[PDB]
Design a protein around this ligand. Structure first.
Ligand SMILES: CCCCCCCCCCCCCCCC(=O)O
Ligand SMILES: CCCCCCCCCCCCCCCC(=O)O
Lengths: 270, 238, 56, 256, 125, 270, 60, 60, 83, 56, 56
């Protein structure tokens, strides 16, 4: 892959008019800078590589995180899988109407002590469990519930001090691609939930401590990272303008087109 | 046991790295591909598509349609300046929110040739000419048409055909340029000057409008992906 | 059953092998450069020529 | 002898002739067609009404005024009350279609103006308030054009859609809409515009009432400006032709 | 497809496009050129600025009124204050040049008028 | 690569004069020791390898370090990337006017307790994050700011006890090489900043703790190490003499040419 | 899982070592070379250039 | 010592993974196969077998 | 391994009766949807892979666990092996 | 003494080697697709034809 | 797709392979010995001979 060459040109007097066209045809003129002026023969070795889709969408990104503790009310963290709860990733996928790719998950887990008066706290190495539950499956309501046996559901056992865990997932959609934007209802009566929320059922993701690990309370932090691969795309569109509001719908707060400046002639931003 | 020595960089998580990982759901079955119109293989094919330019940012008009319109009015004397804006496609407020503006902000470096397409939306009978000038840096934006001449200019004429194409060539002492504002590599300037005052018949409207377009030529290229400062966040969306 | 390809240079070969039984485990393909702008620019039925007027 | 200003389109019975126009923008470059048997899903044999369906329709013409913000239609449900394509829509669980949109607004040489005809696949509009969602009655109307509103919509407890033009209802820059296929109606050198849309969707076939996959938008950039004494009332008219329709899974009559 | 009404001229940087015009009258039929070595006199090697010189300039536009008699310019000294062609004029004892004059006056279909563009070698007033 | 041989020579009487020349030509005489005396044939197996540029510039070096804590005022450390804030590396690059090479970064991170009266301090394994921000990008003003999601910007997650992290970076300059010395201003009016400070915009480097890690305060130390590779050079020059002063400019304090000694005849240093 | 045994010297950072590391910015595009006068391939070509000698160090 | 770099995902236990492990009882001897009627090679051959449908669920 | 194709069929009038059979034979009829209606030729690329026994029984599963301490009554854990 | 096979795709090769001396150490075989429904459906002595009546 | 070269001795071969897709990931090249002193010493237009007087 390489940039095209700019071919040289001498003077010109002739009835052929490159510099004119009609944009009303919805046709972007192909005119190259050699047409409207004199140009020297130049070889360009610049490459378009880093502009390909693959390098554009493929970077790890932090979609979300939770907090679960070693004791008390919340002993585990549950999250439904949507990319849209993190701003900067969701925008990178809103260029393309229909996207296709294979997720690569990576988790980053950290632990934190909590203030308490407990005496003779002595740590031990904690062990985190991460369980995936495809839709409709059983839902644990308590940490010791039988569902954690994971007779089937893919699950990962992890330990502090080791490398962050990683697993790859193939393309899970029913149709021929994921859909970022969907106009329609879920019900033939045009009622109920509107928007893309209906298409998205990915199941649920859970995590827990395996063992108490110490006498004193401990709070943990988990982080998910997507890294799309093998990407294909279709039907690009305008980037989003107004700040996001909700994760279930495109709702926005009306905001201006751009920033402003002084009188048209003024050559500097304000 | 084949002897081996770990090297610095083991057990680290790099954001951009390339590695193989074991699949979490073996022998999963993938639904077949479909043929969908409009398949993008590269972002450069977006960068060649025309887009409107909010050339008029003045005041509070940015909340209306008038941000996209350029007033053109019959004067009593010739040589007045129609408009002008600096060329900093990733920084300057003009191109900031444009189509080309968005794609750049993800990238630090770029080079190529930016086309500017103009289209005269005025009344069918009224005619006119215009001088589209490009002044490379080294001096302030020219304040008199006579000064704009010494740049690279295309005298453009209204008539049966409508659209015009001003192709800004690539002139710089480096190969690439920062997309972020810096005084070292600063791009240049652009102006539009009345060549000949707008002539209008009777009963035809005096004032017209001119819309601008932006696109990247086939020599365009970018580099060094990064974050875009525009989109904000506070706490996770719900 | 290895394979050989070329790195990304400017002014060499690397040996890669797929170790897993699932396509989704293979490394990303960074090198596909194929580009055809005709699907966005020039989306017209009648092919238009640069050297000629648009509306004749 | 020939001309590039003139075009004649013929589908089924109807025919549309225009002596001033530009070329016909075709989709993304894929001319619409039937369904190859490689991608098929439904195992019933599809109905192909052909001439009964493929032909031109004309919706209600809408006035165009100096302050008029713009308009949008939803194609999958617009025609639903017109012709057999409205009937063959209600009796099937699946449909596959592509659209030829033809917009007609003419004016004398003394009328300034510019329009923007874009055809936006899967336009998803937000809501007035942030929590709710638009009602099915507000996003749609039978054969009738819904119009934008030039200034922000006050946010109550209602379900109203957000009609501001400069965000185009999708919360994007209106100036950027040209990535989608489009053409420019310009009262100077043009009269009518034309678009051909192939079938775009995630899955090879779709239900018609649930999912409206193609949205049509006409947004004036340069308002109508004319000296007094010239005729005031200039309508805009839209023409919509399905192409290569197919249907599957015949069922009882209704939508519910 | 083509038209005789339209013309596009390109010299150096500048370009002039016109959608309504007639053909280009060329001199007496001798297209301008450099100096052949048969007729040369000066034995120093000549400078050929090319793009630095050859390009279009635009002088001050002048109003045109019902009673306006007319106008005249002197080409060898008009440009003398403009561009390098003004600079390269002051630093040399000799010059050889030829001119492409392009006059632009447009009006709507309701304006009557006729102009005469002549280029007169050695007009002595 | 090998040293040249010294060819033997007998006596000489002749009008050819190797021992004489004129240095006014700016021409270093090529005379070899066999010319001015008698010489025996000798083979030299000495090699010039270790004097090549590659072995000269390629060694890891500590350019800089910071301190950021787990609580209080400073919770993260920010640094702009210049080689010139460390003496001994900057000098090794001032031989060559124009240098070209591909950095290899390596970080070394350490943790230190801080004196406090907090009771029942129990450590957990800390996790450091290191984020790179190419120029113009968003700048985090607080540790929890959204920018740390790193939807794009290359970022590294690290853990204590593991090996030091390492990443390689290719050649990032705009021009055809980095420039160590630049004479000129940034503004066409010959005003504003003078010197090489204008050319250098490399972006910025950040680091933070991911998790609090304990109840008691903890201060951390990060260290950067350059290791140039694939080096090319141009236009060598005199080494710097006077001690450095500022990192933005060549400013120096006038100092003598050399050390001194006693009267010219004296054969020993003082 | 090919059996393996770490050897002394793993997980150490040596200053002068030679190893490969994964690139942090994949498929980055490098600007082409230029031909600059005075290209040094080796320091020995500096060591053959004349230089003045402060032979008189006496006093101040 | 062949130089090597661990990658993220080492020292983790994945539920569905595929790997080789050393046998705990080397050279154990396996009893020969027998030919048993009704060998299932795939579950789909169960899914084609008829079954009764509790069509009437009403009440108790 | 792949799903079978569904072969197309036009109309039918004939004395051969696919739609009828007798289940009393303990014989599941092989009738395919092309028999009782009109059908278009369709290629199916769906695969039965993930339904094989191997992928069905092979997943790790937690059969059991115990607790043993460092001091006191129970210093070790014993378990007989049953799934 | 390596071996080569094909991954699982939809719209490639991987190199596997057995490192141990015991069959039970080899990796699982996920790829055996052989299927013969005749051992559950159609378990009759007299072969019955679809196109004909069952009990004649 | 390996490669073979020679070590640094005085009075042997090593096998190297590039594992990454980016040129900047390849190991340093320590072995390039090419040297041409003529670009600093002897920078004159008229070539001067050792055996002759400098200024004649
Ligand atoms: C431990 C196993 C974890 C498995 C992680 C599964 C995560 C599924 C990811 C789905 C991806 C992005 C899809 C958006 C869905 C939609 O809106 O249609
Ligand atoms: C986590 C990613 C870290 C990336 C580290 C990027 C460091 C850039 C190094 C630039 C190198 C030496 C350049 C001096 C610049 C100049 O003066 O022109």
């Amino acid at each position: 892959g390489r940039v095209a060459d700019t071919v040289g040109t001498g003077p010109t007097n002739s009835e052929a008019i490159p510099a004119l066209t009609a944009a009303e045809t919805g046709h972007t003129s192909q005119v190259v800078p050699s047409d409207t002026m004199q140009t020297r023969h130049v070889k360009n070795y610049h490459s378009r590589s880093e502009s390909t889709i693959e390098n554009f969408l493929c970077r790890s990104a932090c979609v979300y995180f939770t907090e679960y503790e070693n004791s008390g009310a919340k002993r585990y963290a549950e999250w439904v899988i949507t990319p849209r709860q993190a701003a900067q990733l969701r925008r990178k996928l809103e260029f393309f109407t229909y996207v296709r790719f294979d997720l690569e998950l990576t988790f980053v887990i950290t632990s934190t002590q909590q203030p308490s008066t407990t005496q003779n706290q002595d740590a031990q190495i904690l062990t985190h469990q991460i369980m995936y539950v495809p839709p409709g499956g059983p839902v644990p309501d308590k940490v010791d519930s039988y569902v954690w046996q994971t007779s089937t559901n893919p699950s990962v056992f992890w330990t502090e001090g080791n490398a962050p865990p990683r697993m790859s997932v193939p393309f899970l959609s029913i149709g021929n691609a994921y859909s970022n934007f969907y106009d329609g209802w879920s019900e033939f009566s045009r009622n109920g939930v509107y928007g893309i929320n209906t298409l998205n059922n990915m199941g649920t993701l859970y995590a827990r401590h395996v063992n108490a690990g110490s006498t004193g309370p401990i709070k943990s932090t988990i982080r998910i990272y997507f890294k799309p691969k093998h990407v294909k795309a279709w039907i690009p569109r305008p980037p989003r303008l107004c700040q996001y509001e909700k994760a279930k719908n495109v709702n926005f707060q009306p905001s201006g087109v751009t920033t402003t400046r002084q009188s048209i002639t003024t050559m500097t931003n304000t | 046991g084949l002897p081996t020595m770990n090297t610095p960089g083991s057990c680290q998580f790099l954001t951009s790295d390339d590695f193989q990982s074991p699949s979490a759901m073996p022998q999963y079955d993938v639904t077949p591909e479909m043929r969908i119109p409009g398949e993008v293989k590269n972002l450069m094919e977006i960068a060649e598509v025309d887009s409107v330019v909010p050339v008029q940012n003045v005041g509070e008009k940015v909340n209306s349609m008038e941000a996209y319109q350029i007033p053109v009015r019959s004067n009593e004397g010739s040589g007045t300046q129609v408009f002008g804006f600096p060329l900093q496609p990733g920084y300057s407020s003009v191109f900031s929110r444009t189509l080309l503006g968005e794609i750049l902000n993800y990238y630090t470096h770029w080079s190529g040739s930016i086309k500017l397409t103009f289209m005269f939306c005025g009344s069918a009978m009224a005619t006119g000419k215009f001088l589209l000038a490009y002044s490379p840096p080294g001096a302030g934006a020219p304040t008199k048409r006579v000064d704009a001449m010494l740049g690279t200019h295309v005298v453009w004429d209204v008539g049966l055909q409508s659209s015009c194409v001003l192709c800004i060539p690539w002139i710089s002492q480096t190969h690439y340029r920062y997309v972020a504002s810096d005084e070292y590599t600063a791009g240049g300037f652009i102006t539009c000057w009345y060549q000949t005052n707008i002539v209008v018949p009777a009963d035809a409207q005096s004032s017209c409008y001119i819309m601008c377009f932006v696109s990247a030529c086939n020599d365009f290229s970018v580099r060094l992906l990064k974050d875009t400062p525009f989109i904000s966040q506070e706490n996770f969306f719900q | 059953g290895a394979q050989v390809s070329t790195q990304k240079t400017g002014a060499i070969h690397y040996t890669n092998i797929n170790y897993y039984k699932d396509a989704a485990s293979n490394s990303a393909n960074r090198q596909d450069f194929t580009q055809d702008p005709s699907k966005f620019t020039e989306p017209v039925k009648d092919i238009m020529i640069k050297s000629l007027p648009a509306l004749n | 002898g020939y001309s590039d200003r003139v075009r004649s389109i013929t589908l089924g019975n109807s025919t549309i002739t225009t002596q001033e126009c530009a070329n016909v923008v075709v989709g993304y470059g894929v001319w619409p067609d039937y369904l190859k048997d490689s991608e098929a899903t439904a195992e019933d044999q599809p109905t192909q009404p052909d001439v009964a369906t493929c032909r031109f329709y004309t919706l209600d013409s809408v006035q165009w005024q100096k302050t008029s913000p713009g308009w949008w239609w939803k194609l999958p449900d617009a025609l639903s009350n017109l012709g057999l394509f409205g009937q063959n829509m209600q009796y099937h669980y699946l449909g596959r279609t592509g659209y030829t949109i033809h917009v007609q607004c003419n004016a004398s040489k003394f009328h300034q103006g510019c329009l923007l005809v874009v055809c936006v696949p899967e336009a998803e509009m937000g809501c007035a308030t942030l929590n709710n969602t638009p009602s099915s009655a507000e996003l749609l109307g039978g054969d009738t054009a819904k119009e934008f509103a030039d200034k922000p919509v006050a946010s109550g407890s209602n379900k109203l859609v957000q009609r501001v033009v400069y965000n185009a209802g999708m919360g994007v820059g209106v100036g950027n809409l040209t990535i989608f296929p489009h053409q420019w109606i310009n009262l100077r050198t043009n009269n009518s515009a034309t678009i051909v849309m192939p079938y775009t969707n995630s899955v090879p076939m779709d239900n018609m009432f649930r999912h409206n996959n193609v949205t049509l938008m006409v947004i004036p950039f340069v308002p109508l400006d004319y000296c007094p004494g010239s005729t005031t009332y200039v309508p805009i008219t839209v023409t919509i032709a399905p192409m290569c329709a197919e249907y599957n899974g015949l069922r009882l009559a209704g939508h519910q």
